[PDB]
């Protein structure tokens, strides 16, 4: 669907957060560039967690509606519950 | 074991003294695998030839000679399930049968005699597989175990006097489950035989010791009557797993 008329909770679900963090950490562990500045951090999990806290993860979530349509939500657009 | 029927698995009243109440496996085999009590003995089997000959020699009536009008008052006689005839004086017949079993003249102690008074049937079983345990015989309110028997049993070494001679003296008696039906037992003589506020006076047998109801594994439990029955069962199961 378009950027307007999006119907979905703006809060990011726990499942979306979990999969986004896992995928990002896998990417960072594959030497993907890191958006946020790290300070002596070698474990991709916590680096991805701090990216998520910094709204810098370069992933948009493809939310499939039951009718077959979909909505695109950037990670920064979604507000983290935690 | 997969069957969800719970009735066969339950502990029946008939298991007293013959099968251990506590010792049983836990799982799909609960209540279906039973361990034997300390005093329980399985009937080995015997030919009912002498019993039939004695009964014929003891009057009674063979089935071909009954008048069907005279069978209602008489009491039917069963030997190993076979209907061999009727008898008109159950008292003396049962008394003589018990006396013979006590003296082991014609009927071995393994054979059992049952008198169903209300239904007028007398059943004698000599077949194998019957479960039975020894019990002391009580005449009036006194045991037949006297001081001389115990004195001789203390002397059991180099006396050639053993349990078999005690059985042959008519003091102890082997009673199966369906003969236990017609018997009246007491816990201990020094408690239930002496006169008190009248509860019963027709005690015909007395238990050797009530702790004989337990099996092998359950007999190792110290103070098992102070325990919850599930804990006694758990210990009876775990005792087989104890190392030594």
């Amino acid at each position: 669907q378009a950027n307007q008329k999006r119907i979905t909770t703006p809060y990011m679900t726990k499942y979306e957060r979990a999969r986004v963090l896992g995928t990002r950490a896998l990417q960072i562990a594959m030497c993907a560039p890191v958006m946020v500045e790290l300070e002596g951090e070698t474990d991709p999990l916590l680096i991805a967690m701090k990216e998520l806290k910094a709204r810098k993860i370069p992933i948009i979530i493809r939310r499939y509606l039951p009718d077959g349509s979909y909505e695109d939500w950037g990670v920064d657009e979604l507000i983290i519950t935690d | 074991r997969d069957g969800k029927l719970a009735k066969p698995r339950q502990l029946h009243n008939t298991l007293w003294g013959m099968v251990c109440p506590a010792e049983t496996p836990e799982g799909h085999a609960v209540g279906l695998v039973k361990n034997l009590a300390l005093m329980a003995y399985i009937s080995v089997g015997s030919q009912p030839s002498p019993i039939l000959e004695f009964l014929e020699e003891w009057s009674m009536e063979n089935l071909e000679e009954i008048s069907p009008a005279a069978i209602a008052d008489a009491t039917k006689i069963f030997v190993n399930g076979c209907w061999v005839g009727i008898h008109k004086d159950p008292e003396q017949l049962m008394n003589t049968l018990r006396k013979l079993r006590r003296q082991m003249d014609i009927i071995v102690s393994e054979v059992s005699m049952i008198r169903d008074i209300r239904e007028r049937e007398i059943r004698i079983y000599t077949d194998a597989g019957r479960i039975c345990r020894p019990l002391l015989i009580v005449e009036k309110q006194k045991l037949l175990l006297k001081k001389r028997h115990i004195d001789q049993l203390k002397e059991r070494e180099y006396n050639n006097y053993s349990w078999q001679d005690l059985v042959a003296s008519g003091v102890v008696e082997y009673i199966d489950t369906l003969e236990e039906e017609t018997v009246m037992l007491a816990m201990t003589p020094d408690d239930l035989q002496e006169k008190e506020v009248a509860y019963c006076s027709t005690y015909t047998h007395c238990e050797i010791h009530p702790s004989m109801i337990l099996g092998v594994c359950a007999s190792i439990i110290p103070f098992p009557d102070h325990n919850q029955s599930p804990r006694n069962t758990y210990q009876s199961a775990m005792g087989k797993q104890a190392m030594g």
Binding site: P66 | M184, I213, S229
Partner: protein
């Protein structure tokens, strides 16, 4: 000596056992209380019990005072032998020692008979434990296999794999079951006077305002009529909410489950901001009203500006909005909570944040969660539940509900009474007799077939006094009548227990058999109740018999067949399929009548209700003086055939709640609702078995994974 009068609905043995068990239970309870009252504060059993770490009060009772009565299959120890428990006891000994009551405690040690009875009780417990196995595992597997694909989609609608709508919102409110807690409405079940005293915000006093509200705000509240009008509008809206609650919650149950604890959060706001209740507050009540109105808009379960969306949102948040307006009332804020402006703003922000956190996350697999949350208590439910009016409970009842059993083991039906029948016991007995199926054999002392060639001969001597008068009026005396007589004796106790009279019996006989039967009976003055029945033949020729022996069915054996039909199929009173009806005054609030008095309070009325063994709902509801609204039955299929499918949804919900909450355990309403909906949503009653899970139009791979495998794939 037969002085024991049997209680109604119970036999002599049943009431004797009930009285003995009552005495033994009273003794055990008294001994346990006596033992516990003697425990010193240093006693470690008492320490464990009061701490709740392990053990119970009955554990201490069995340790010290009395082990208690031992039961097998819910009854005292049975007579395994010929009317005796053990060979050591006399026959027909029903005393506490013979039937299993254990006088000794574990510390004292059990007697050998008591030891064996305790062994039997422990064997029963062990059998139950080893059975708490395959069948409850089967319940778990069947439930989830029915629910494994049910999911909350991204529009928050709960749908299965086919995208069919199971629930529009999860749990009917769209909230996750983790963050919700128990709360009290505080607007349900106060008196009208107390409701106004607590929620009106009376500004006329002008002195209490100066004490609760700041001096500056008092003049603003008093002077401005807009403030007063808006506050009165708020109170009117709260009264409407109170009426809505009283419609929603009969029985006056104020304990409700809601996302955020408003009272605890108000208290947190008090502590955080150092709120002093002794001082007047600076919080303007109109600011409270506006804050509540604005906050209610940001709590969104249904997203949309459509009127349908507006109504769906209002319904989804209705209960929580009512509670929010109740707790955040202006008078409550000014009187109890004393919150300040910053505290109130923080409270609104916290409410919004907590409610937003409580919203169910799309993608949550609520089907499997509900199935596992419903089957988990089944591993704690009594398999062989025993606990008259016997009702199947626990795992067997759960199997009956889940499998949609055509024939329940204990199908019952509760009856409520409208008029004076509810209050007066005589009319209650009248309704009970009109509902309980009574055949002739239930009221006949004995039946005899006599041969009476002449009716005035009267081979029975006692009848000659009264048969002659019926046999003297024109005709009906001799000729064209069967010489074979069917004489029936009626039991007076049964005759008057049902308030039945001979004329109604004769009317039923005439209706069943027509005028071709001659029915003669005594009067109520006679000490013994008799009824004479003959056969009437109109054949006046009676020559050569015309060889009627082809199927003549001679009058003797014909009368025998007629007597059998009378005794088995006369259905004198009540309706068939109703074996017996129990009548009692319920002391439990759920079965009592609750009304709203003139003061608006909830009063629970004590009225007679009827419970039946066997069920026929359509005719029971049609009977007079039977409440057509509140009369329900526990069996589910008949409600489907009678009251529809939504009634089945509600009734199945209630039955599942009863079978789960009977032990005292609690399960969130969302899982019960999800299961009941997934069963009653295709339009018919979908049982949770291979017959109904595979009847859905799902994928063959879905069906093959569950109990059918090869056959489903073969068909596909």
């Amino acid at each position: 000596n037969n002085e024991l009068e049997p209680t109604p609905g119970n036999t002599l043995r049943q009431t004797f056992e009930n009285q003995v068990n009552r005495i033994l239970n009273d003794a055990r309870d008294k001994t346990g209380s006596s033992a516990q009252k003697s425990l010193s504060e240093y006693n470690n059993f008492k320490s464990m019990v009061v701490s709740g770490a392990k053990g119970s009060k009955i554990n201490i009772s069995q340790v010290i005072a009395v082990v208690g009565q031992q039961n097998v299959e819910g009854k005292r120890i049975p007579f395994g032998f010929k009317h005796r428990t053990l060979p050591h006891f006399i026959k027909d000994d029903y005393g506490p020692e013979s039937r299993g009551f254990v006088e000794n405690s574990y510390l004292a040690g059990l007697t050998p008979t008591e030891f064996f009875f305790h062994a039997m009780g422990g064997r029963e417990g062990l059998i139950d434990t080893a059975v708490k196995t395959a069948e409850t595992g089967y319940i778990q597997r069947r439930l989830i296999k029915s629910m494994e694909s049910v999911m909350v989609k991204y529009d928050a609608t709960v749908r299965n794999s086919i995208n069919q709508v199971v629930q529009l919102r999860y749990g009917e409110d769209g909230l996750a079951g983790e963050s919700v807690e128990f709360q009290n409405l505080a607007t349900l079940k106060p008196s009208n006077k107390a409701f106004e005293k607590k929620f009106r915000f009376d500004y006329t006093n002008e002195r209490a305002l100066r004490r609760t509200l700041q001096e500056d705000l008092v003049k603003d509240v008093l002077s401005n009529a807009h403030i007063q009008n808006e506050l009165e509008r708020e109170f009117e809206r709260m009264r409407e909410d109170r009426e809505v609650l009283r419609v929603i919650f009969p029985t006056g149950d104020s304990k409700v489950v809601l996302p955020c604890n408003l009272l605890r959060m108000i208290w947190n706001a008090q502590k955080i901001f150092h709120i002093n209740p002794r001082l007047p507050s600076d919080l303007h009540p109109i600011k409270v009203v506006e804050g509540v109105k604005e906050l209610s808009k940001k709590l969104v379960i249904v997203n949309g500006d459509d009127p349908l969306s507006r109504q769906a949102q209002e319904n989804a948040t209705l209960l929580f909005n009512i509670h929010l307006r109740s707790t955040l009332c202006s008078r409550r804020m000014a009187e109890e909570f004393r919150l300040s402006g910053e505290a109130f703003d923080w409270l609104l922000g916290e409410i919004e944040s907590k409610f937003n956190q409580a919203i169910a996350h799309p993608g949550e697999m609520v089907g499997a969660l509900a199935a596992q949350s419903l089957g988990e208590p089944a591993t704690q439910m009594t398999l062989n539940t025993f606990h008259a009016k016997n009702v199947t409970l626990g795992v067997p009842r759960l199997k009956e509900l889940i499998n949609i059993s055509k024939k329940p083991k204990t199908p019952s039906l509760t009856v409520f009474l409208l008029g004076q029948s509810a209050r007066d016991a005589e009319r209650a007995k009248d309704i009970l007799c009109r509902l309980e199926h009574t055949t002739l054999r239930k009221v006949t002392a004995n039946t005899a077939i006599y041969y009476d060639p002449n009716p005035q001969s009267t081979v029975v001597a006692e009848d000659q006094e009264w048969v002659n008068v019926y046999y003297e009026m024109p005709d009906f005396d001799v000729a064209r009548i069967s010489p074979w007589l069917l004489r029936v004796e009626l039991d007076r106790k049964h005759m008057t227990d049902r308030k039945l009279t001979m004329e109604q019996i004769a009317e039923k006989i005439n209706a069943g058999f027509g005028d071709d039967l001659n029915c003669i009976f005594n009067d109520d003055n006679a000490e013994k109740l008799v009824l004479r029945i003959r056969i009437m033949n109109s054949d006046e020729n009676k020559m050569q018999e015309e060889e009627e022996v082809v199927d003549k069915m001679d009058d003797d054996v014909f009368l025998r067949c007629i007597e059998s039909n009378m005794l088995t199929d006369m259905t004198l009173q009540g309706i068939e399929q109703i074996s017996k009806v129990y009548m009692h005054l319920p002391q439990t609030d759920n079965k009592k009548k609750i009304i709203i008095t003139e003061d608006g309070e909830f009063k629970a009325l004590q009225e007679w209700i009827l419970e039946t063994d066997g069920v026929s709902l359509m005719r029971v509801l049609s009977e007079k003086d039977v409440d057509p609204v509140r009369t329900t039955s526990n069996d589910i299929v008949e409600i489907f055939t009678v009251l529809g499918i939504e009634a089945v949804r509600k009734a199945l919900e209630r039955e599942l709640y009863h079978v789960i909450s009977f032990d005292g355990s609690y399960v969130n309403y969302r899982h019960l609702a999800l299961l009941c909906d997934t069963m009653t949503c295709r339009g018919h009653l979908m049982a949770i078995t291979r017959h109904g899970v595979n009847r859905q139009d799902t994928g063959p791979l879905m069906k093959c994974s569950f109990e059918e495998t090869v056959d489903v794939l073969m068909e596909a």
